[PDB]
Ligand binder design. Sequence first.
Ligand SMILES: O=C(NCCCN1CCN(c2nccc3ccccc23)CC1)c1ccccc1
Ligand SMILES: *O[C@H]1C[C@H](n2cnc3c(N)ncnc32)O[C@@H]1COC(=O)O
Ligand SMILES: Nc1ncnc2c1ncn2[C@H]1C[C@H](O)[C@@H](COC(=O)O)O1
Ligand SMILES: [Mn+2]
Lengths: 672, 670
Amino acid sequence: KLADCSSKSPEECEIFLVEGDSAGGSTKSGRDSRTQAILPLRGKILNVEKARLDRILNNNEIRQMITAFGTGIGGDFDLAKARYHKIVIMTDADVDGAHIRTLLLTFFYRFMRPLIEAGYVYIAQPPTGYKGLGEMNADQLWETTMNPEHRALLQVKLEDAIEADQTFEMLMGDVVENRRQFIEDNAVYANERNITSEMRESFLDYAMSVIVARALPDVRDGLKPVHRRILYGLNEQGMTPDKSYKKSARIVGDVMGKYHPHGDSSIYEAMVRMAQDFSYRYPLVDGQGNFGSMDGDGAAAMRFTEARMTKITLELLRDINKDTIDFIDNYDGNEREPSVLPARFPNLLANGASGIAVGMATNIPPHNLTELINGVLSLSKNPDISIAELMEDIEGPDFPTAGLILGKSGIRRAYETGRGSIQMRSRAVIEERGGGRQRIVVTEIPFQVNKARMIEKIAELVRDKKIDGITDLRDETSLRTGVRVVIDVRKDANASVILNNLYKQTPLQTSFGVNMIALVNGRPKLINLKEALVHYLEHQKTVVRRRTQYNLRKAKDRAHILEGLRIALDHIDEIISTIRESDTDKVAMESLQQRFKLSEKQAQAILDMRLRRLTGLERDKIEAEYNELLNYISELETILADEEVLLQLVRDELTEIRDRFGDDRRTEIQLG
Amino acid sequence: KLADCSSKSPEECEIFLVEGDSAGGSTKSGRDSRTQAILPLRGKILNVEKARLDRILNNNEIRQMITAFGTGIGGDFDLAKARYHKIVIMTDADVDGAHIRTLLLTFFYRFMRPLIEAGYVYIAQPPTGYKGLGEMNADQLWETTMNPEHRALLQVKLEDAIEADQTFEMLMGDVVENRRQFIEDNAVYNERNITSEMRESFLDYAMSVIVARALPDVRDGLKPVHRRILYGLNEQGMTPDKSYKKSARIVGDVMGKYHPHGDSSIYEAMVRMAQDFSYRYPLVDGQGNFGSMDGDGAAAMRFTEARMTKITLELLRDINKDTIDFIDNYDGNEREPSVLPARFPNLLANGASGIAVGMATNIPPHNLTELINGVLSLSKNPDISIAELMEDIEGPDFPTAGLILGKSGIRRAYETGRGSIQMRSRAVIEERGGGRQRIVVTEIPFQVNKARMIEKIAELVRDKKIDGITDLRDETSLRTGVRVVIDVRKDANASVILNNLYKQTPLQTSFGVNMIALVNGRPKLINLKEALVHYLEHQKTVVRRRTQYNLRKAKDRAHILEGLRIALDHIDEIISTIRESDTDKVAMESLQQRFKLSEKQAQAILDMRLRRLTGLERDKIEAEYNELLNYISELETILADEEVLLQLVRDELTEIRDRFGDDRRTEIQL
DNA sequence: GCCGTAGGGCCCTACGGCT
DNA sequence: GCCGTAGGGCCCTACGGC
Ligand SMILES: O=C(NCCCN1CCN(c2nccc3ccccc23)CC1)c1ccccc1
Ligand SMILES: *O[C@H]1C[C@H](n2cnc3c(N)ncnc32)O[C@@H]1COC(=O)O
Ligand SMILES: Nc1ncnc2c1ncn2[C@H]1C[C@H](O)[C@@H](COC(=O)O)O1
Ligand SMILES: [Mn+2]
């Protein structure tokens, strides 16, 4: 793995650390080989501030580095035996390289301090706008970043042992609470180097990145960027329900050239999760081929699979090209993307969310679309509606895997505060199997409980004689039968006691521990149910208001044009003779505007008209269209005038989603 | 790996063998778990007929299959110890599936023969046109392939143990000539019998590899996966003037439209085309880490970026002018080119290597200036000898430079299509001070890993097989270019060590020329005069069809323009006519009726916008027709005479030589 | 120790002809 | 034992809560 330099003279040799081999080859092809050694790593390195010494010292990349440096570590560390006098960090110019970078400083800091103290450690500054250094051309990497004559290494300064320790303790250490509070305080949601300055800046930039632009969903359409991009990716290449499937690999290439500069499996498996009906309560993707199973199996590889939108997914993208939502430059400015989807149903809650961020994490369960909506409706009529009153409509989450939820206290605590624990329970019955003996039949398991892994924890529990009663465990699941897991019982054993044991002892009963965080105005926030429904319904007010302002503007732009087309066709031949006497396109435009009182666009419209638009009935079609538009226009000014009318539309259109898409509660909420 | 079934009665238990987890996942889903086990393998299993008995038993997949059957092997076999009374071969429905099939049988037949005797070996029948079984939903894989009520299996039948021994030895044994002679022999361009499957299946594989994988086309020099690559770039306008599109987009364009195969096959093959130490006239221009002379792979395709070079435009030039026959891609959803115009002789310029089935090919690059001088000579002399030609084309011309030792292998190679040609690094001895010397190498042979080469040397010094060396450094720099230094012990002879380096290490290597290409969709060993004769014949046709095409299009455009011209003449009559027809269709009939126009001159008049009644625009129409009229009669000239035509191919060939023709890199020492 | 978006990469097979 | 298209798949790491 080590491409070493040739000179064995420490003082003038330096070593570069890079994220892996894609970067290695460009750095090996660009280095001055005499004095510069290259070490590739393997992406995210161990956080050593967190992991203990047996893990540390048995980690492949740390070993190589210690070896590489010849210094030993900790006590043993010694500065004379250093094989290089410049150890240079040179990670991707991206937030994930900024993190790797803090992961290395932490490591150097806890095991190789004297090294930062002799001023041996440096950070390299490659130019932004590449995905990794494996995207740079050889010379260019060398010239802007590795050539000792034009390059700009930041040398790492340690100024205060006290400050440094604390810094590290907070940012990299296991206590999430002080790392979280570091963020709230410093976050702004919109050449020698001080190691504390660097650690603080670099980890923040990564945290703020992970929080707003990765791991947590938006309140308004329920999605995290990758899902938004994918789903935006499909829409743009109209890979719609009524059209045939399309190749998983083209979709993912497209999405990764255009909206998502992250790896292909982070994206392809995002798309798969959206296709699985045991993951999404209302699947957003339609899946052709092997897309996984409840025994944890991965999808086929993405050359085999094909996909397109679910019908429900169109209701997220409806009204998108009517100015409803702001577009933003994508990562490289060659392309535009939606900052949010219209989302004509409350996605966040219906399909829920799970996500791990920094200094926090989120976990929102799925719900039943019929309930949500009826709930949104009640609140549309009563801004003061209480949480007791919402749970008349929304009984509680509703899993794609169904099963039971034991009681309303947890639901209640979690809808009131955004936090609470809900005990999920498999659907199990006890039934006879002939010969005077019984069995347990579970046919439904909790949400996010791997069945084969649960079926092994059970086998394990009987293998290790921690449970008396069980005579055989089989998995009789199939497409025909559905999920069917059978557990025989030994003759005469009570089977209720045995089932109950399994609930306490196995994932057969799991706790979903709700933590309803989502992105409210690009800043993360713990919300309870009413907050969530309010932001969403605030979002629909803007989606309809803006679609209607759009249509009105469009409608007026048209009627102006028909005002001009009417006049052509009412003066046709003197229009024709105006054009013919004139030589250039501009001089014609000059003459019509002035002659028949036109605007630029009208004259322009008149000049773009085909002769087939002069056939006889054409005049009338026009007049017929002008009048209906005037009507139309009037209506849309009604709807922007009266807030109640505006908010009455939203309902109507909401009432129509429910009608078309709403389905029966799957998960039962036993009480007691 | 094995997903077992619930029952322990082999009676009713059967086990389905698939390609992997892409395919196993869709099979695990669709199965009846009671009676139906699944062992997923991993791609091509070892060919036992060419393997050693130690290797075979160590082999992971082999072992899992043995355990699965639980019957032991050879003399320790036991038919009463069989865990499933039906073993089912359920591979992808593609040539490689077939291949894997044949391989699996070979294992069965050599070690578990009594399993085919006992009637325990079956072959499943998934539907065709899926890349894998993983492309299939579970339920649909169940209704077709796995459900006892609908599935149509084949019980593999052994009939004659001796034709089956001769047959396995022939197809899967390590003597090509028989296997080759089998393809030639058989090449055309329920219950089942084992021999009869083996021939038909191996033949489906071999034939696929030979015509649609491993062998270039004598016309454009391209394997299918390269051609598809260059068209993918064309059909996304990824041209050199435009910026650099991401490697993942292309690779994804190509896969789904064109090439139903692994994405690492594509990207690596597009990679090769960007590297200036591999291609003599690099076809792809890449932004980022594209590998090294030291064996370094390219960077992952999420990072790298690429477009056409300038010279690939020439391979593609006029592709869309019906210069070439399009054909239906794999799934019937797109059109892809059978071949590219190839406006310079790519096959020979960039050369080619591919390991086929029953045959291989290995052709070297050449210098484009000489190649084109060659073709010119041939155009004005059909009866030119390989030797005449050789006055133009000295010999090959590697992109890595170096020295060729002699002309005899070359001569041989162009007369017959086969020969050895000995390649040497360019190397020189020079002082370093103090009497002492070094050896400094600067170009190295084609296809030689500069790193592997150095290590080999370092192993030889350490093991003392080579004497008189005191150091060994690679001082290659992008700035100074390739530079390998070897420090001779004082007083030692440097020229002897050197000729010792050339005997023992890749410093000298041989290229074994073997010029097998596809001539009319059929694999053939050709020679220099045929490589160039089949190229010229392709130029004649490419250019003749374009100039035909270009004439059909002008004559159509002329026609329409004679329409617009009549409109402008009688414009107020036209107005009149159109205003007094209620509908378009009634205008259309009246306009044709009225002014003696064809159906198309009328639509185009109905289409004309008004802006085209302005003075400039009027003149614009008159310019187009006089110009095009004159163009037409030029096209008509060319087509009238084979010689004016041929001379055109020469003036176009000459232009390209002029523009991209470059200096010789490899020296031929007499 | 697993839920799910992120960074990062390596190894078995077939096939032919040269060494 | 390498060359070059093909079949096929696996492991490490961060991050937070339970
Ligand atoms: O970026 C894309 N593909 C990347 C190829 C991913 N390889 C897929 C298979 N890989 C591996 N699979 C199993 C085991 C592995 C073990 C070591 C290294 C790679 C492995 C390594 C990564 C892509 C493909 C098509 C369209 C868009 C992107
Ligand atoms: O690395 C092994 C393979 C190499 N080798 C080169 N050429 C041959 C041929 N023709 N046959 C066998 N091996 C060849 O030599 C090394 C040792 O050989 C084996 O054990 O295979
Ligand atoms: N809620 C929980 N908290 C901590 N460990 C849990 C856990 N659930 C399962 N485990 C397993 C994982 C490890 O095998 C081991 C201890 O944790 C550890 O050291 O990583 O126990
Ligand atoms: Mn429990």
